[PDB]
From Swiss-Prot, chain G:
Its job: Modulates the activity of the host recBCD nuclease. And thus protects linear double-stranded DNA from exonuclease degradation.
Protein name, UniProt field: Anti-RecBCD protein 2
Lineage of origin: Viruses, Duplodnaviria, Heunggongvirae, Uroviricota, Caudoviricetes
Organism: Salmonella phage P22 (Bacteriophage P22)
Swiss-Prot record, chain H:
Name listed for the protein in its UniProt record: RecBCD enzyme subunit RecC
Shown segment, full-protein numbering: 687 to 748 of 1122
Record gene name: recC
Consequence of gene loss (knockout): Decreased degradation of DNA with free ends that is unable to undergo homologous recombination, which can fortuitously lead to more efficient viral infection. Cells are deficient in DNA recombination repair and have increased sensitivity to UV light. The cultures have many inviable cells. Cells can be transformed with retron Ec48-containing plasmids.
Subunit structure: Heterotrimer of RecB, RecC and RecD. All subunits contribute to DNA-binding. Interacts with YgbT (Cas1). (Microbial infection) Lambda virus GamS protein interacts with the enzyme without displacing any of the subunits.
Function: A helicase/nuclease that prepares dsDNA breaks (DSB) for recombinational DNA repair. Binds to DSBs and unwinds DNA via a rapid (>1 kb/second) and highly processive (>30 kb) ATP-dependent bidirectional helicase. Unwinds dsDNA until it encounters a Chi (crossover hotspot instigator, 5'-GCTGGTGG-3') sequence from the 3' direction. Cuts ssDNA a few nucleotides 3' to Chi site, by nicking one strand or switching the strand degraded (depending on the reaction conditions). The properties and activities of the enzyme are changed at Chi.
Length: 245, 234, 62, 63, 144, 125, 47, 62, 63
């Protein structure tokens, strides 16, 4: 049919580079793009690394910058592999690191550092060592005040009981999350709950609250209970079709 | 036979395209007619006959000057001329039909023109324009199947068909266009001196036996042309 | 290319545009081959905004 | 009986169009296919003529 | 493993930059892009200054690609304005200005880049593959 | 002589064209006027404006620069065909024949690797 | 520069340009062609 | 609108004055549209996607 | 190959060749190949050619 697909695109480029004429093709890509910067390199397929190596490995006057975090390699289901990332990590001599966290309050950074320092080799891979990170000076003032009382950066809601089933766990946690989000919204509508950078503040709108879920049925279980309280919500990963309504 | 030739929009366009690229100063070529019938897809049986028919068109005489289409050189002819005529004030059917009926009997025979007000431009394609003896003419091809017999292509029947398909207004507008173009181009132009009339050529009506059958000749009144020009101008 | 023609005789017939609108201001800036934007290199130039041209609030040309 | 008459045609042509042919042999194919499969009408005649014209132009350049 | 300074990072051969979350991995892309456009760093710099069309950036998602393209555009604009004014309020731009030898030529190159930003080569992996196949269907052996 | 008219707006140019047409008349009435345009909309606008000014616009040829240049080739020099032998459409079918005959050459080695796996001459075409 | 020359038809409105051209049509046509050096000199003076 | 050269075209390697490309053609069309506007110029573009409430951007010309 | 011969024929032609139109207008075209400009310059001797060029800037803005 003369058609083509994503996996077919990658496989065809790889085959071309591996073939006899691919050498010429390599120059065609190398002269075109002297420097290439790959981001989110932890999610990498063996094909992609073979291509990048074939093109930019040892030729002069051509740089290559790999930027990635192995602790975030979560696309294994999609064909990505962490082992090829570690292979690349072994094949590269130079390594560079960023020390400070610029994203979140110093509370969240300390919370994460404490939770991942419990055991040794937490990620159970010898090539993935965990180290504590330090927050930046800009965020030292960040706080979240709820009903006049500063809330802890991280709060774990423990369910009650000895043995809890999967369905009971899902229903109870969905209900609890719905109730807590409703309380946050009610307290922010009156100007009490504020996200504060030093003296500046702003109420907690229904937009800044995000619920991270793993599966579709999980998201629907969240959304149903959240709409039971007449709270507007939307699921960004919704792939349903309009015609099914 | 030409009368029994297939008719329609595409047959008519093919018949016109034949003359569009036909050289009048040379005899018809059989291979060319065969190729055109191959393009149109018609039967090759027409190829011997149609060629002859084409010559019957080229050699047929015209208005009393006696002009043959073969006598027209490439310098004295203009085929498929496109014209643009502006109409400034709105053109009312009643305010025009009255004048056309006043100066033309064909309009007087027919019911009044009916169309909505129009202001803007007017487009049109004149089939042929040619000059003979320093006198210009207008030639319009028509392939409408008036009748099955040659009597349906006589003077009275041709005038009846003109009145039925309202070709009167058509040739009147064509004459206004030609008049304005000649006045624009020809230095020291005069209507009566330089204009020669209008010639409707019915292809199927063309017969070597009868000179009158197939051709129709009519000259619009100069007063009608002047009043129509003034009406369309303001 | 047009300037490089040897046997060419050219006359210029332009029409000046009066800057009565924002759109006419832009067209006049283009026609007169002059630059109106202020970069603000000087601190005195950067402080005051009078160097720019007044824009009428009701104006809706662009 | 009508449907079975269509498929029969659909059979014949699907055997005729398989083999490769020189350009001059491709000339009558379009016309035969049009007149066999289609019964023209006032509106469709324009499209059919355009089809024949483009096909003839392609094969004419080729020849 | 060494601590990373965007201005001192050498751009030659293969280089791996690994860090934890929210540490500014993506944010460093813009600084490296500006360094490449202006050819700054001396010994650590590229041998020659480059153009927008010769820098390849590969991201994971389309939305991230659009975000990064817009942010690079904004950074080029702000750095050009700073070069024209010779002063700035950001520490990164301040260090860059300290590193730049001639500011007028730098502003000219930044202007050209800003005008060519429509042709910025910021793709995903699949888009990069498709584009390299189409631009080189002759060598790859594909259809046109 | 070749006279170039510069104007920031088109209406001035069109009115200059009008005045030049009216000033110097064509001797032969059947000689068509020559106006080069690369778009049909431009020709449509020129016609609608010229008709509005003069009273009617007709016998105005609107050829493309390439077609006009070839027409001038035909008229100035003898023994020149009506249509050029080398055109975009015919060079296609000529190269389609020529390419298989030249694959054995060394210079076309790359092309060979391109044309090795074609089945119905898709790559060739 | 060049205002006295009949060639220049630059004006404030379309009608003024058309009239300035119409009055000096014959004078423009009769004038001999400008030399390339003269054209370059005029364009340099205008800049 | 972007239409890249074939890649084995020799013109785009060493270009000269007068060589035409789609990019320059569109960039000049945008200037023609501005210059030809006599009274009002209206420009529109999609800012946010209706489906995802994402953020789109305007052309470099705008 | 025809360009140079066409230019040289009119360059050395003592009188105007027959069949050429009186005058030509070039309106609405802001881009032409240099070869077409050379041909029109060589052809301008015999017949007059009026180029209507919409120029957005008053002054000389090319190079
Ligand atoms: N040098 C810096 N100065 C100021 N803010 C910074 C700096 N580096 C990063 N940030 C900010 O830090 C936040 C997150 O940085 P980011 O570039 O996304 O790191 P990241 O590695 O991409 N996080 P992630 O994508 O989850 O791995 C943004 O708000 C940036 O503006």
């Amino acid at each position: 049919r003369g058609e083509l697909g994503f996996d077919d695109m990658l496989s065809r480029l790889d085959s071309a580079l591996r073939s006899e004429s691919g050498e010429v093709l390599a120059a065609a890509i190398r002269t075109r793009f002297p420097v290439a910067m790959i981001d989110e390199f932890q999610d990498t397929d063996p094909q992609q690394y073979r291509i990048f190596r074939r093109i930019w490995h040892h030729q002069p006057e051509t740089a290559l910058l790999l930027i990635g975090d192995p602790k975030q390699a979560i696309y294994a289901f999609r064909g990505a592999d962490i082992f090829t990332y570690m292979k690349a990590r072994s094949e590269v001599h130079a390594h560079y690191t960023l020390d400070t966290n610029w994203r979140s309050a110093p509370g969240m950074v300390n919370s994460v550092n404490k939770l991942f320092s419990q055991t040794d080799d937490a990620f159970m891979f010898r090539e993935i060592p965990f180290i504590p990170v330090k927050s930046a000076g800009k965020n030292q003032a960040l706080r979240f005040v709820f009903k006049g009382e500063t809330q802890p950066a991280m709060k774990m809601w423990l369910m009650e009981g000895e043995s809890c089933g999967v369905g009971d766990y899902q229903s109870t946690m969905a209900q609890v999350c719905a109730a807590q989000i409703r309380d946050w919204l009610q307290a922010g509508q009156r100007g009490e709950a504020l996200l504060m950078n030093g003296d500046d503040a702003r109420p907690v709108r229904a937009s800044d609250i995000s619920v991270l879920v793993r599966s579709r049925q999980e998201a629907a279980q969240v959304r149903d209970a959240l709409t039971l309280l007449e709270i507007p919500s939307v699921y960004l990963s919704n792939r349903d079709s309009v015609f099914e309504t | 036979t030409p009368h029994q030739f297939p008719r329609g929009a595409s047959p008519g366009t093919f018949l016109h395209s034949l003359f569009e690229d036909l050289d009048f100063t040379q005899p018809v070529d059989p291979n060319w007619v065969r190729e055109k019938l191959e393009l149109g897809g018609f039967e090759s049986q027409w190829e011997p006959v149609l060629t002859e028919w084409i010559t019957a068109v080229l050699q047929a005489p015209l208005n009393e000057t006696g002009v043959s289409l073969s006598q027209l050189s490439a310098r004295n002819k203009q085929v498929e001329m496109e014209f643009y005529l502006p109409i400034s004030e709105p053109l009312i059917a009643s305010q025009l039909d009255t004048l056309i009926r006043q100066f033309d009997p064909l309009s007087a025979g027919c019911p009044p023109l009916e169309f909505m007000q129009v202001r803007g431009m007017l487009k049109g394609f004149i089939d042929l324009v040619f000059r003979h003896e320093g006198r210009y003419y207008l030639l319009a091809y028509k392939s409408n199947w008036l009748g099955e017999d040659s009597s349906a292509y006589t003077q009275q029947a041709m005038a009846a068909a003109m009145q039925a398909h309202r070709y009167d207004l058509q040739y009147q507008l064509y004459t206004l266009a030609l008049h304005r173009y000649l006045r624009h181009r020809i230095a020291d132009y005069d209507y009566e001196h330089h204009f020669g009339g209008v010639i409707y050529l019915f292809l199927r009506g063309v017969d070597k036996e009868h000179p009158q059958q197939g051709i129709y000749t009519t000259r619009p009144n100069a007063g009608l042309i002047a009043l129509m020009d003034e009406m369309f101008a303001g | 290319l047009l300037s490089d023609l040897e046997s060419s005789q050219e006359l210029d017939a332009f029409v000046d545009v009066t800057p009565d609108n924002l759109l006419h201001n832009i067209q006049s800036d283009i026609l007169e081959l002059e630059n109106r934007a202020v970069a603000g290199v000087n601190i005195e130039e950067f402080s005051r905004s009078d160097n720019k041209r007044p824009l009428d609030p009701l104006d809706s040309s662009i | 009986g009508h449907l079975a008459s269509l498929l029969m045609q659909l059979n014949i042509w699907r055997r005729g169009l398989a083999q490769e042919r020189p350009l001059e042999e491709w000339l009558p194919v379009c016309r035969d296919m049009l007149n066999a499969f289609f019964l023209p009408d006032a509106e469709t005649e324009a499209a059919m003529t355009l089809i024949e014209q483009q096909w003839q132009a392609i094969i004419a350049e080729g020849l | 493993a060494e601590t990373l300074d965007p201005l001192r990072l050498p751009l030659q051969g293969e280089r791996l930059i690994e860090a934890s979350a929210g540490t500014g991995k993506t944010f460093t892309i813009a600084a490296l892009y500006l360094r490449l456009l202006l050819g700054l760093g001396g010994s650590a710099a590229f041998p020659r200054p480059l153009t927008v069309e010769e820098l390849l950036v590969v991201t994971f998602t389309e939305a991230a690609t659009a975000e990064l393209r817009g942010r690079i555009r904004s950074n080029i604009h702000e750095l050009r304005i700073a070069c024209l004014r010779e002063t700035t309020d950001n520490p990164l731009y301040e260090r860059l200005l300290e590193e730049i030898d001639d500011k007028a030529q730098a502003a000219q190159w930044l202007l050209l880049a800003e005008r060519q930003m429509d042709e910025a080569a910021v793709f995903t992996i699949h888009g990069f593959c498709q584009r390299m196949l189409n631009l080189n269907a002759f060598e790859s052996g594909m259809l046109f | 002589m070749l006279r170039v008219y510069h104007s920031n707006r088109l209406d001035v140019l069109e009115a200059l064209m009008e005045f030049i047409v009216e000033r110097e008349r064509l001797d032969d009435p059947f000689e068509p006027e020559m106006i080069l345009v690369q778009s049909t909309g431009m020709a449509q606008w020129l016609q609608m404006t010229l008709s509005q000014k003069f009273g009617i616009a007709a016998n105005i040829d609107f050829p493309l620069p390439a077609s006009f240049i070839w027409d001038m080739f035909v008229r100035v020099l003898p023994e020149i065909p009506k249509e050029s032998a080398f055109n975009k459409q015919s060079m296609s079918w000529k190269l389609m024949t020529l390419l298989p005959q030249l694959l054995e050459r060394e210079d076309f080695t790359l092309l060979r690797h391109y044309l090795t796996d074609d089945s119905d001459k898709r790559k060739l075409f | 520069y060049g205002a006295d020359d009949p060639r220049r038809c630059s004006g404030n409105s379309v009608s003024e340009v058309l009239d300035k051209f119409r009055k000096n049509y014959d004078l423009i046509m009769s004038l001999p062609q400008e030399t390339k050096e003269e054209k370059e000199f005029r364009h340099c003076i205008w800049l | 609108r972007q239409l890249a050269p074939l890649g084995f075209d020799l013109m785009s390697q060493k270009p000269k004055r007068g060589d035409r490309s789609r990019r320059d053609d569109d960039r000049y069309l945008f200037l023609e549209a501005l210059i030809s506007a006599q009274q009002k110029l209206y420009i529109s573009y999609i800012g946010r996607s209706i489906q995802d409430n994402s953020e789109r951007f305007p052309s470099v010309l705008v | 190959n025809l360009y140079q011969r066409f230019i040289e024929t009119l360059e050395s032609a003592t009188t105007c060749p027959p069949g050429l139109p009186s005058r030509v207008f070039i309106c609405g075209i802001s881009a032409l190949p240099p070869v077409y400009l050379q041909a029109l310059q060589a052809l301008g001797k015999h017949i007059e050619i009026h180029l209507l060029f919409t120029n957005p800037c008053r002054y000389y803005w090319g190079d």
